Every structure is written in structure tokens, then in C-alpha cells.
Design a protein around this ligand. Structure first.
Ligand SMILES: [Mg+2]
Lengths: 229, 223
């Protein structure tokens, strides 16, 4: 079947991204990392979290412009740049500077695609969380004791040559649950921004609640939940 | 259903159409021309060639494992690494094998089951010297003057490793070969033969399907 072969070609691209993303649930030093990406097979949403010298933990949720194959190639680039930077530190950092490097790579006529991502670096020893948002995507929702709210911040998404990126630091309670979301919200533009903050609270902050969803979605949907308690 | 996926597949095709240089493009007497014929829209075969301080020129022909979307992702990766390294290098410069190694380190460990097969070459315009470095088992480049092969990476190993005539025409080829003939070893001694008796230019490559494997060829000519 003609459709058969191209669908085989598409699932070869989906199968290839599954290996690229880390495993879940993955817990270290009390922090549990869990992600759920729901792709037309090839997604523009990609989440990645890696260990750094057992002292610093980094993670991000990125969504490339639109969806499908076109944007699926950019997620490949991001995973390369990130892991590469670590090795680039040599055998022998404000995240802002990372989103900047991510930015420079995109600008050089690289498919003319821009990615919106939320970057977060956590110091395990001093319970410090330094997050840097570069996109206009729905802010992160951290959860404490039955209540949740947005960690607000402004900006460029990496399509301008001048960074102008600003990142903020925040300390972590003994029991916390940060949640990162993609463009999809259905799971009034701004009356829909208040839903996630209230819905995430009232609902089980664990990924277990997020898994319950499994007719495709207009835009790719992907979430990352970091919790410790 | 199918029409939607077709429109998504065509998007990945148009993005790679601009990703590759224009043809034919000639500099200092050297004419670079390539012809990539995808089987399923998205191809694993990618060719690229760029200027380097107008003294040295780099070119390569890559074939990622298999074909389609899955392998199409790696080509974008190769395209980035190369143009980025030149921005990294700056003044000092410093070997096609050394770059074949930078590409090597990036792919392994960050990727599973998608190794690259490449024919690397850097030519010094000033002294008429071409430095070739092959890392894949793909069909050797076919020299043109009578033709002939040139003597010559998923593993952690890094074992990756000439004067040129006044008139010459080197040609790189993919793993795919259609000879419309009845005749592996005999099909490897034929390219050198068919390439000679046939017009060395892309002109002939332009005239002449689908799978099993994607087909792409790079032709560097000088006369
Ligand atoms: Mg999107």
C-alpha cells in the first residue's frame, strides 16, 4: 500500500526520537523526573534532562514552531547542542547563556525555525532552582501542599541575533512539584491560562495523572513534572 | 489521512532543498554539482560543499543508515556541525580525518542505530592538492582523466584517515546502483567503467528509481 510505506517512513522517525529522550520515571537525590510527550508521529515538542557533576541538574521543555517532520528536525539539533556543551566544558553557569548558544545555532539560516523552551538548572546541594524562559509558552506550575502558581518571567524564543535573555533563581521547599507544559492546554486566551494553575493543583501532581490521557491533537502536547518529597 | 501525511512529508523535503548548496557552482575553475534523488521524499543521502578562506575547499557525500525520515534527521545534524566548526576554527584552521572525528563523537552516544557513511575531501586551490578522507564502506570516488578508484563510523575508535591533474573530474556516489544490467564485486568495478565511457558531467547524471536505497552523487570537475 502506498500509504503503508510512508507511514512506515514516519514511524521510523518516531521510533528514533523515542531513543533520544531519557527514561521515566527517573529519580535522583530525591528529585523525580517524569515526562509525557503525545505526538502526527513526528513531534516538535522535546523534553530533556541530564546530570551534571552530581551537583547541578538541568532540564528543559522545548516546542518548535508548528509540528510534524519539519519541526522534528530541530529537536534533533537541540539534543546535539546540549549534550555537546557538556563535553565542550572539557574534561578539566547561568542557563541564560545556554539559551543564547541555542539561539546562535538557530539563527544561521537553520531552517528558519524558532523554538520556545523553558530552561531550568537545579543545584541539589543548596536546593536552588534557576529557571530561564525564552518562549511565550505556558509558564511552569510548581506545586506545594494543595496550591500551585506560575513562575513568571518575560522572554525572543531564539530568532534574534541579540540575546537579551534574563533568568531568575528560586529556592525549593522540602516538598515541591514543578510542572512544565507545551502549547497544548485542552488536555479566552488568558482565561485559559488560569486553568492549568488551578487544574494542576486540584489534580494529582504526579505524572500518573498525566498518563491517564491516551483523535490526535491540533498541536503537539508535552509535559515535564519535577517533584520531591 | 494520506494526503495530510503527504503534505507533512513534502515539508521535510522542501526544508532540505534549501539546506543543500546550488548547482552548478564553480569557483577558481572548479565546478561543484550534485544530484540527490530521494526515494521516500526524505532522504538519508546529503551532500555539501563550502568555501574556506578562498584558499581551501571542503566537500563531502554522506549516506546515513537506511533511508526516510529516521535517517533524514541525521543529515540536518551533519549540516550544522560542519558550518559550525568553521565558525569555531577561525584563524588557526588545522585535516578531513580530524573533522570526520568531530562528526563521529557527536553521533555516537547521542544516537542509536544511525551511523553516517561519508566521503570527505578538502582541496587546496593554490597548490592544486586534494586531501581525501573516507570513513564509510560506500563506493569509492571515481577519478576521471580512463578512470579509477582512490585507495582508502559507529564505534568509539577513531581510526579515520594528493596531486591533481590540470584537467580532472572526481565523482562521489551513494550506496545505490542501477546498471539495468544482468550482473557485488562486478558492480563495484563497473562504476569506474560506466563513468569513463559516459559523460563525466552532471549533465549525464541529470538524464537518468525509488528504492531500495536513496541515490546521490557529487561531481567535481576542472578543465
Ligand atoms: Mg507547536
Amino acid at each position: 500500500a502506498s500509504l503503508n510505506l510512508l507511514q512506515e517512513d514516519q514511524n521510523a522517525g518516531r521510533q528514533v526520537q523515542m531513543n533520544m529522550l531519557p527514561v521515566t520515571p527517573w529519580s535522583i537525590e530525591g528529585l523525580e523526573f517524569s515526562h509525557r510527550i503525545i505526538p502526527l508521529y513526528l513531534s516538535g515538542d522535546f523534553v530533556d534532562y541530564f546530570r551534571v557533576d552530581e551537583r547541578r541538574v538541568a532540564f528543559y521543555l522545548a516546542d518548535v514552531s508548528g509540528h510534524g517532520a519539519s519541526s522534528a528536525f530541530v529537536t534533533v539539533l537541540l539534543k546535539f547542542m546540549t549534550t555537546r556543551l557538556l563535553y565542550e566544558s572539557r574534561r578539566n553557569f547561568k542557563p541564560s547563556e545556554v539559551l543564547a548558544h541555542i539561539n546562535r545555532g538557530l539563527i544561521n539560516t537553520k531552517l528558519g525555525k524558532h523554538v520556545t523552551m523553558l530552561g531550568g538548572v537545579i543545584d541539589l546541594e543548596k536546593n536552588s532552582l534557576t529557571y530561564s524562559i525564552g518562549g511565550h509558552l505556558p509558564l511552569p506550575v510548581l506545586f506545594v501542599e494543595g496550591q500551585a502558581g506560575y513562575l513568571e518571567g518575560r522572554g525572543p524564543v531564539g530568532l534574534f541575533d541579540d540575546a537579551t535573555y534574563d533568568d531568575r533563581v528560586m529556592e525549593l521547599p522540602p516538598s515541591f512539584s514543578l510542572s512544565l507544559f507545551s502549547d497544548g492546554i485542552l488536555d479566552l486566551k488568558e482565561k485559559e491560562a488560569s486553568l492549568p494553575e488551578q487544574v494542576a493543583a486540584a489534580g494529582g501532581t504526579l505524572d500518573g495523572l498525566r498518563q491517564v490521557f491516551g483523535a490526535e491533537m491540533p498541536d503537539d502536547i508535552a509535559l515535564l513534572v519535577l517533584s520531591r518529597n
